[PDB]
Amino acid sequence: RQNLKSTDRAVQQMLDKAKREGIQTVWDRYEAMKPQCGFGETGLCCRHCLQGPCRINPFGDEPKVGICGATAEVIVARGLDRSIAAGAAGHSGHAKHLAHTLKKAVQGKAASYMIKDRTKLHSIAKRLGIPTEGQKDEDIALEVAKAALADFHEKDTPVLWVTTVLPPSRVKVLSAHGLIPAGIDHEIAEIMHRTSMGCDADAQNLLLGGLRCSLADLAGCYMGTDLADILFGTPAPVVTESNLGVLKADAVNVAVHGHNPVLSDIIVSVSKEMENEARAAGATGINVVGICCTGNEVLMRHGIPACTHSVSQEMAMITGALDAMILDYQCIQPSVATIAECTGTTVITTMEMSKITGATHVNFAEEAAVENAKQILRLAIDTFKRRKGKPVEIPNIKTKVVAGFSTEAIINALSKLNANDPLKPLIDNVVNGNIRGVCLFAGCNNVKVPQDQNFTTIARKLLKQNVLVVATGCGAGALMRHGFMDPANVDELCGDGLKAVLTAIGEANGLGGPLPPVLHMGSCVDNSRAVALVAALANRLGVDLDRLPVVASAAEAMHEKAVAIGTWAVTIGLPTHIGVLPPITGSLPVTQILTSSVKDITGGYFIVELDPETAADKLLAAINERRAGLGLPW
Amino acid sequence: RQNLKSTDRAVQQMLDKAKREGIQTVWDRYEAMKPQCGFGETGLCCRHCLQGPCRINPFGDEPKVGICGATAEVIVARGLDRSIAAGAAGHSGHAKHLAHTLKKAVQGKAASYMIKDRTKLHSIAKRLGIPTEGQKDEDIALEVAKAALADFHEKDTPVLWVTTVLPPSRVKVLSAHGLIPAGIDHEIAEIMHRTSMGCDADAQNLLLGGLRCSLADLAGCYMGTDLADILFGTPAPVVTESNLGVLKADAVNVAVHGHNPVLSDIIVSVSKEMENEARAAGATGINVVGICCTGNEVLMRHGIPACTHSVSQEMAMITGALDAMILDYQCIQPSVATIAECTGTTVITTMEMSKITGATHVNFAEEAAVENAKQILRLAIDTFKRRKGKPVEIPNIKTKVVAGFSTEAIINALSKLNANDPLKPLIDNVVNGNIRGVCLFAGCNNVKVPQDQNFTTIARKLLKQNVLVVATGCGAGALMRHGFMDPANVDELCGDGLKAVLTAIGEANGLGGPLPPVLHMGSCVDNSRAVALVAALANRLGVDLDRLPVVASAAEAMHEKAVAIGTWAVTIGLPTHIGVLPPITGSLPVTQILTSSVKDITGGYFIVELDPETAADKLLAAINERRAGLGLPW
Ligand code: SF4
Ligand code: SF4
Ligand code: F3S
Ligand code: F3S
Ligand code: FES
Ligand code: FES
Ligand code: NI
Ligand code: NI
């Protein structure tokens, strides 16, 4: 019964092939882990010193307290804080790498990289207060890169990738609670300090630190988007495909997998120059396909088709047609290195701090990006040759995907209805009820949840209630693989008011049809694009984000990064659903802070709800409560 | 049978009082935790994403691998790396606070602080390459503080508090393996990134990252010592007392507890100015006593007596005479806040990122240090008044302690035997066998080990074999409370060769007697002083640290900080004993790297040995192997 594992029928087909071939999958490794530890599930375990491990019984008798005296409240809050810091360390490490890449590019140390989006560069400079008039673009870019790197440590200003991206009234609320980060890596380190043994031991104090570190994560996300747009271009609407059927038996199939596209954007361009070298090997060409966020990056900017996402990533290899999987970091199941020996795929790591035993490593350096890409693609061509004559099983399943909805692209699309006040048509339709509110789907799949089931169940209910739905990361991946990015499905999926708006915008953009049911705003760092859009709406209305009918749903969350994103969504003022249990239920006081009393600090709050129908109802209630607070019908 | 809990007879007495009064202690909370989780004990548990908790059976059947495919090797190495980063975050956060304090002092923003050790300031400037000739001391200090803060982030130089404190040949070895940190908080964040889900998954690669982060911890330790010496004075030999008998029923007893003495050095000076205000309340005066590292700081600089350490910290409160416990951060059992309600003690937190529910918080700001100290001490005086007429039970147990052996003080003491080559007398006596080698005892007590039993058992065996023993932190605390810092015990404890050397040095310093059996080199950050001494010996000999007959023992380790210290001791080239099991035994490959194949990278290695007699034999074998490598008899 593969339907209990994944709602994706291409994934189901490959699960059947993996089973008859004896290849263990993530779902098999989950089954072998059951029953999982209830102390860990509830957050009532601590290993922060060598007197541990400590645990607390959720209910009953002793143990009731950690060996040092740490209560359930403290243990739960410390664990959560460390998860937030780990997420911030990933998103911001990605951003730091892009900042170094931009600096190298404009210093003449990496000519494969350049300022591709001069407009974005100048707008970021203006937002940061960096002078542009009279200055060479390379010098403006050097100053932007230096400002990015400066936000990682303490200085005479707070983190500008927080304070310059949210409205002043929001910054004021956060400043009053001490929540503005002083420096990105500074906050990460302070979390690790305060959560170490014999330090912070007050749940509220710990959680305030967590909120501040989540804003350091937001800064890293926004910095990542900004720098990637400068270097690689701001996305605009594009049409492509998704799911395993985008693989081609006749081609060299190369997946780019990870989050930082610094090399894989180069993989894309170099691959086109090697079509003839691939043809000499008997292929039709090189077919680059995306997995996870780096796949989203190249989908958004170049229309590279998305193969699969998150929990089902191993299934691309099970087809037998994946000649190479080119990795950088984050969200890569290390099982890919052993599965590759069964499937023939060449798995290649490229970043010094992210290696996998058994996978080939090819150092990637920006300074040698083209040469390193050719080395990598030649391993892929050799692999294609080795499968001459072997049957492959690529499920003939794919969907049409319209994507590329950066915030700039959304504003441009709206400007076709109102050129000099582009946000007003959107606001007008919120006011008149054609758009009930906005929901951002974000985050991962999680093996505990039948793959995509929460995203699609919740999205269907919200769309029928006229909610404008936007999506990023593997939430966008789930929705795209089930047809939610195909405008042909607007009639089936969308309420009449939402359909009218999507159609009015689409027709004004010359499409002869609507925008798609869900707007793909990009990778997980590109959750920052949704922040930009919401902050622009807030500023246009003269209100703060916690008055807007905007919610978020990390419906199948997995990674520490998703915990960090959900926490900053709460911190900036949003009702934020999470569809898997974070390790908090072992402390009622912590749960009550995160789901209730944080409303009094930031106006946002977590909605923890594992039943997707119920979660949809709770998200709609949150949207409608915001409508009522604005005096609007609902 | 309290002897199974602590070998300290004052602690035993208070354990009897706690038992009859029904006050739960750390030992009771340990007993209530048994049996502890074997997955956590062995390191075979991962909670790095919301698909967990994952575990691996040490032996038997499934589960054999994490849900994402993470092997035992990966899980163990990731957990260890996070512990190292957490330790680095503590030591370096302490250092960062001191750097900000020095900057404020010389900018005229905090006149309670000043350059007290101008000689240290100029020597640090010279070591860092900061110009002094022609410059005002305040400007040199501003440049030192700015250099300290710069080492937290990437810049055009590596972390100078690594590269300028180790000999060039050691820096070259470490650079060749990629182990020199780029920035302190940079490395902490990169650890949290690389150990997050779907990132680094190669044990060797992970552990190399851990070694590099441990050097970021060393940098924070050395920076902490350097800045504390500038601000508060470099220690020189001092005589005081230790153990609970240093409390006085007739006085206001105030413990300073934590690690950062930035306020407690101020507590010491302000307390003397309030003797009359205390006398008006019916006390004889204010009796400041030390717990843990901040107690070590004021013991080393001012001869403040040490009350207790680490695992037994609650027992100071059980006497009934502890009127206040003034806290900043790290190693404070949060149980003190609840015990205080039973004992009458006022527990006071002072740092924004380290609060304890139920404890009074008094913001400490350097800018208002004196006024904030008086507010704190007045709460203590009020508490003393409330116990007018209540009997107290202070065990009449204390030892004499000679301490204050900074590296400068050790060199000065040796210079009385050889004025212009002060290290030569020490080397001469290593060569002739009067000193077999050097052992640094470091780190915490741990409730799993009868308190002090490993430190004293190992130290006794090494001293009888003519090993020069130095100590820091709660290792120094254990040894001082058992008489190892009293020169009257040299005859009983020391081999004939070591006694001859300690006597020759002492007589040349005019003491009419020897140096004490063990040299107290200070707090845990002051493990950096031992590095300075060993590096000076290495440079004097023209060899690297991994050829010297010098070892370390974290004989009863507890905190993540102790894991970080042990790891940098290995990274700089030392055989390093740990007397409690770190969570590594679930992976034989990781254990073999840490205890064997790391020798081929850094020349150091861990010695994991829970039996103290066996550990002493293994440490002596390590020392003697180094002697043999130098061509010396042993
Ligand atoms: S920090 Fe406290 S609760 Fe955590 S493992 Fe150590 S003794 Fe146990
Ligand atoms: S990172 Fe891997 S091993 Fe760890 S909890 Fe997540 S699925 Fe399990
Ligand atoms: S790339 Fe990763 S953080 Fe989640 S959104 Fe996808 S599994
Ligand atoms: S102050 Fe703390 S780090 Fe260990 S050495 Fe003492 S318990
Ligand atoms: S007791 Fe299972 S997660 Fe620690
Ligand atoms: S299963 Fe006990 S430490 Fe996780
Ligand atoms: Ni993601
Ligand atoms: Ni310590």
PDB file of C-alpha atoms in Angstrom, chain A residues 18-173:
ATOM      1  CA  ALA A  18      12.638  -0.295  -4.782  1.00  0.00           C
ATOM      2  CA  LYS A  19      10.726  -3.026  -2.953  1.00  0.00           C
ATOM      3  CA  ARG A  20      11.183  -5.703  -5.573  1.00  0.00           C
ATOM      4  CA  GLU A  21      14.880  -4.743  -5.950  1.00  0.00           C
ATOM      5  CA  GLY A  22      15.479  -4.831  -2.194  1.00  0.00           C
ATOM      6  CA  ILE A  23      16.596  -1.194  -2.002  1.00  0.00           C
ATOM      7  CA  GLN A  24      15.832   0.276   1.420  1.00  0.00           C
ATOM      8  CA  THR A  25      14.130   3.679   1.385  1.00  0.00           C
ATOM      9  CA  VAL A  26      13.454   6.468   3.878  1.00  0.00           C
ATOM     10  CA  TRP A  27      10.027   4.908   4.504  1.00  0.00           C
ATOM     11  CA  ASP A  28      11.620   1.547   5.330  1.00  0.00           C
ATOM     12  CA  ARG A  29      14.093   3.224   7.679  1.00  0.00           C
ATOM     13  CA  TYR A  30      11.183   5.009   9.376  1.00  0.00           C
ATOM     14  CA  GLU A  31       9.300   1.723   9.824  1.00  0.00           C
ATOM     15  CA  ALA A  32      12.443   0.206  11.369  1.00  0.00           C
ATOM     16  CA  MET A  33      12.594   3.119  13.856  1.00  0.00           C
ATOM     17  CA  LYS A  34       9.117   2.543  15.281  1.00  0.00           C
ATOM     18  CA  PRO A  35       8.110   2.996  17.994  1.00  0.00           C
ATOM     19  CA  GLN A  36      10.168   6.181  18.344  1.00  0.00           C
ATOM     20  CA  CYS A  37      11.293   7.447  21.733  1.00  0.00           C
ATOM     21  CA  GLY A  38       8.533   9.306  23.534  1.00  0.00           C
ATOM     22  CA  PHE A  39      10.973  11.431  25.533  1.00  0.00           C
ATOM     23  CA  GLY A  40      12.465  12.809  22.341  1.00  0.00           C
ATOM     24  CA  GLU A  41       9.041  13.174  20.697  1.00  0.00           C
ATOM     25  CA  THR A  42       7.785  15.372  23.564  1.00  0.00           C
ATOM     26  CA  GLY A  43      11.062  17.267  24.000  1.00  0.00           C
ATOM     27  CA  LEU A  44      11.681  15.771  27.458  1.00  0.00           C
ATOM     28  CA  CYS A  45      15.290  14.700  26.893  1.00  0.00           C
ATOM     29  CA  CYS A  46      18.515  16.645  27.441  1.00  0.00           C
ATOM     30  CA  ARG A  47      22.083  15.699  26.493  1.00  0.00           C
ATOM     31  CA  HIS A  48      23.647  19.124  27.091  1.00  0.00           C
ATOM     32  CA  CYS A  49      26.245  17.755  29.501  1.00  0.00           C
ATOM     33  CA  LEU A  50      28.078  14.555  30.396  1.00  0.00           C
ATOM     34  CA  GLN A  51      25.882  13.957  33.438  1.00  0.00           C
ATOM     35  CA  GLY A  52      23.127  13.070  30.982  1.00  0.00           C
ATOM     36  CA  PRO A  53      21.318  11.788  29.204  1.00  0.00           C
ATOM     37  CA  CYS A  54      18.476  13.220  31.251  1.00  0.00           C
ATOM     38  CA  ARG A  55      14.782  12.696  30.639  1.00  0.00           C
ATOM     39  CA  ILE A  56      11.499  13.615  32.294  1.00  0.00           C
ATOM     40  CA  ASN A  57       8.406  11.440  32.268  1.00  0.00           C
ATOM     41  CA  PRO A  58       5.591  13.341  30.525  1.00  0.00           C
ATOM     42  CA  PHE A  59       3.307  11.888  33.191  1.00  0.00           C
ATOM     43  CA  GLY A  60       3.626   9.789  36.303  1.00  0.00           C
ATOM     44  CA  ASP A  61       6.510   9.518  38.727  1.00  0.00           C
ATOM     45  CA  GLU A  62      10.231  10.289  38.649  1.00  0.00           C
ATOM     46  CA  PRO A  63      12.238  11.358  36.834  1.00  0.00           C
ATOM     47  CA  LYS A  64      10.549  14.737  37.095  1.00  0.00           C
ATOM     48  CA  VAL A  65      13.561  17.059  36.678  1.00  0.00           C
ATOM     49  CA  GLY A  66      16.989  16.967  35.089  1.00  0.00           C
ATOM     50  CA  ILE A  67      20.043  16.095  37.149  1.00  0.00           C
ATOM     51  CA  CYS A  68      21.188  19.743  37.377  1.00  0.00           C
ATOM     52  CA  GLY A  69      17.622  20.792  38.268  1.00  0.00           C
ATOM     53  CA  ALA A  70      16.544  21.734  34.748  1.00  0.00           C
ATOM     54  CA  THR A  71      12.754  21.633  34.572  1.00  0.00           C
ATOM     55  CA  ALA A  72      10.661  20.395  31.664  1.00  0.00           C
ATOM     56  CA  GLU A  73      10.117  24.045  30.693  1.00  0.00           C
ATOM     57  CA  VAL A  74      13.835  24.712  30.497  1.00  0.00           C
ATOM     58  CA  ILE A  75      14.731  21.462  28.720  1.00  0.00           C
ATOM     59  CA  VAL A  76      12.047  21.946  26.071  1.00  0.00           C
ATOM     60  CA  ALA A  77      12.912  25.610  25.471  1.00  0.00           C
ATOM     61  CA  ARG A  78      16.661  24.904  25.260  1.00  0.00           C
ATOM     62  CA  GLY A  79      16.175  22.160  22.703  1.00  0.00           C
ATOM     63  CA  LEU A  80      13.931  24.350  20.599  1.00  0.00           C
ATOM     64  CA  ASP A  81      16.353  27.249  20.745  1.00  0.00           C
ATOM     65  CA  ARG A  82      19.201  25.042  19.503  1.00  0.00           C
ATOM     66  CA  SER A  83      17.039  23.935  16.557  1.00  0.00           C
ATOM     67  CA  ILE A  84      16.385  27.579  15.664  1.00  0.00           C
ATOM     68  CA  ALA A  85      20.096  28.390  15.843  1.00  0.00           C
ATOM     69  CA  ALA A  86      20.913  25.403  13.614  1.00  0.00           C
ATOM     70  CA  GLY A  87      18.376  26.569  11.043  1.00  0.00           C
ATOM     71  CA  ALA A  88      19.773  30.093  11.161  1.00  0.00           C
ATOM     72  CA  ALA A  89      23.262  28.636  10.682  1.00  0.00           C
ATOM     73  CA  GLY A  90      22.153  26.905   7.465  1.00  0.00           C
ATOM     74  CA  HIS A  91      20.255  29.737   5.797  1.00  0.00           C
ATOM     75  CA  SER A  92      22.836  32.315   6.780  1.00  0.00           C
ATOM     76  CA  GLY A  93      25.800  30.113   5.830  1.00  0.00           C
ATOM     77  CA  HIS A  94      24.240  29.857   2.357  1.00  0.00           C
ATOM     78  CA  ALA A  95      23.936  33.651   2.336  1.00  0.00           C
ATOM     79  CA  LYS A  96      27.524  34.122   3.509  1.00  0.00           C
ATOM     80  CA  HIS A  97      28.745  31.963   0.637  1.00  0.00           C
ATOM     81  CA  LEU A  98      26.840  34.110  -1.861  1.00  0.00           C
ATOM     82  CA  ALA A  99      28.279  37.280  -0.310  1.00  0.00           C
ATOM     83  CA  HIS A 100      31.797  35.937  -0.756  1.00  0.00           C
ATOM     84  CA  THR A 101      30.936  34.920  -4.337  1.00  0.00           C
ATOM     85  CA  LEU A 102      29.706  38.411  -5.210  1.00  0.00           C
ATOM     86  CA  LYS A 103      32.819  39.981  -3.664  1.00  0.00           C
ATOM     87  CA  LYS A 104      35.059  37.662  -5.674  1.00  0.00           C
ATOM     88  CA  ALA A 105      33.115  38.375  -8.866  1.00  0.00           C
ATOM     89  CA  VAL A 106      33.480  42.158  -8.686  1.00  0.00           C
ATOM     90  CA  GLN A 107      37.111  41.925  -7.532  1.00  0.00           C
ATOM     91  CA  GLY A 108      37.975  40.046 -10.731  1.00  0.00           C
ATOM     92  CA  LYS A 109      38.644  36.754  -8.933  1.00  0.00           C
ATOM     93  CA  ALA A 110      35.761  34.758 -10.446  1.00  0.00           C
ATOM     94  CA  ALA A 111      34.772  35.781 -13.970  1.00  0.00           C
ATOM     95  CA  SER A 112      32.142  33.032 -14.286  1.00  0.00           C
ATOM     96  CA  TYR A 113      30.062  35.230 -11.947  1.00  0.00           C
ATOM     97  CA  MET A 114      28.899  38.791 -12.517  1.00  0.00           C
ATOM     98  CA  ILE A 115      26.246  41.394 -11.750  1.00  0.00           C
ATOM     99  CA  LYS A 116      23.381  40.012 -13.836  1.00  0.00           C
ATOM    100  CA  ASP A 117      20.601  42.097 -12.227  1.00  0.00           C
ATOM    101  CA  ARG A 118      21.849  45.664 -12.046  1.00  0.00           C
ATOM    102  CA  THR A 119      18.389  46.929 -11.092  1.00  0.00           C
ATOM    103  CA  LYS A 120      18.285  44.625  -8.062  1.00  0.00           C
ATOM    104  CA  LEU A 121      21.805  45.694  -7.072  1.00  0.00           C
ATOM    105  CA  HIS A 122      20.895  49.374  -7.070  1.00  0.00           C
ATOM    106  CA  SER A 123      17.605  48.800  -5.219  1.00  0.00           C
ATOM    107  CA  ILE A 124      19.366  46.813  -2.481  1.00  0.00           C
ATOM    108  CA  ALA A 125      22.024  49.534  -2.216  1.00  0.00           C
ATOM    109  CA  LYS A 126      19.258  52.145  -1.840  1.00  0.00           C
ATOM    110  CA  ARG A 127      17.477  50.040   0.791  1.00  0.00           C
ATOM    111  CA  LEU A 128      20.705  49.735   2.791  1.00  0.00           C
ATOM    112  CA  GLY A 129      21.656  53.399   2.438  1.00  0.00           C
ATOM    113  CA  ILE A 130      24.685  52.673   0.224  1.00  0.00           C
ATOM    114  CA  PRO A 131      25.414  55.515  -2.244  1.00  0.00           C
ATOM    115  CA  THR A 132      25.040  54.774  -5.948  1.00  0.00           C
ATOM    116  CA  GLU A 133      25.279  58.115  -7.741  1.00  0.00           C
ATOM    117  CA  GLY A 134      28.713  58.469  -9.333  1.00  0.00           C
ATOM    118  CA  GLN A 135      29.832  54.967  -8.289  1.00  0.00           C
ATOM    119  CA  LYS A 136      30.929  52.069 -10.478  1.00  0.00           C
ATOM    120  CA  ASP A 137      28.588  49.084 -10.284  1.00  0.00           C
ATOM    121  CA  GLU A 138      31.491  46.923  -9.116  1.00  0.00           C
ATOM    122  CA  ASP A 139      32.094  49.297  -6.202  1.00  0.00           C
ATOM    123  CA  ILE A 140      28.406  49.406  -5.244  1.00  0.00           C
ATOM    124  CA  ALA A 141      28.411  45.604  -5.318  1.00  0.00           C
ATOM    125  CA  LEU A 142      31.561  45.456  -3.197  1.00  0.00           C
ATOM    126  CA  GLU A 143      29.823  47.681  -0.640  1.00  0.00           C
ATOM    127  CA  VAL A 144      26.701  45.479  -0.678  1.00  0.00           C
ATOM    128  CA  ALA A 145      28.814  42.369  -0.159  1.00  0.00           C
ATOM    129  CA  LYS A 146      30.726  44.050   2.652  1.00  0.00           C
ATOM    130  CA  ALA A 147      27.434  45.105   4.289  1.00  0.00           C
ATOM    131  CA  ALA A 148      26.166  41.523   4.010  1.00  0.00           C
ATOM    132  CA  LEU A 149      29.268  40.150   5.701  1.00  0.00           C
ATOM    133  CA  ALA A 150      29.105  42.859   8.380  1.00  0.00           C
ATOM    134  CA  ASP A 151      25.609  41.728   9.460  1.00  0.00           C
ATOM    135  CA  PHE A 152      27.154  38.454  10.733  1.00  0.00           C
ATOM    136  CA  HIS A 153      28.842  40.168  13.710  1.00  0.00           C
ATOM    137  CA  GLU A 154      28.243  42.990  16.171  1.00  0.00           C
ATOM    138  CA  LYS A 155      28.821  46.528  14.898  1.00  0.00           C
ATOM    139  CA  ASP A 156      27.430  50.039  15.385  1.00  0.00           C
ATOM    140  CA  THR A 157      24.132  49.088  13.661  1.00  0.00           C
ATOM    141  CA  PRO A 158      21.864  46.076  14.194  1.00  0.00           C
ATOM    142  CA  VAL A 159      21.357  43.466  11.483  1.00  0.00           C
ATOM    143  CA  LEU A 160      20.290  45.586   8.494  1.00  0.00           C
ATOM    144  CA  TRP A 161      18.819  42.577   6.712  1.00  0.00           C
ATOM    145  CA  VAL A 162      16.216  42.729   9.502  1.00  0.00           C
ATOM    146  CA  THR A 163      15.782  46.412  10.208  1.00  0.00           C
ATOM    147  CA  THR A 164      15.664  47.596   6.582  1.00  0.00           C
ATOM    148  CA  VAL A 165      13.253  44.890   5.360  1.00  0.00           C
ATOM    149  CA  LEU A 166      10.405  45.212   7.858  1.00  0.00           C
ATOM    150  CA  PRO A 167       8.242  48.293   8.352  1.00  0.00           C
ATOM    151  CA  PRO A 168       9.414  50.744  11.024  1.00  0.00           C
ATOM    152  CA  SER A 169       6.418  50.021  13.286  1.00  0.00           C
ATOM    153  CA  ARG A 170       7.329  46.308  13.315  1.00  0.00           C
ATOM    154  CA  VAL A 171      10.988  47.109  14.024  1.00  0.00           C
ATOM    155  CA  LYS A 172       9.803  49.309  16.893  1.00  0.00           C
ATOM    156  CA  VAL A 173       7.675  46.519  18.420  1.00  0.00           C
TER     157      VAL A 173
END
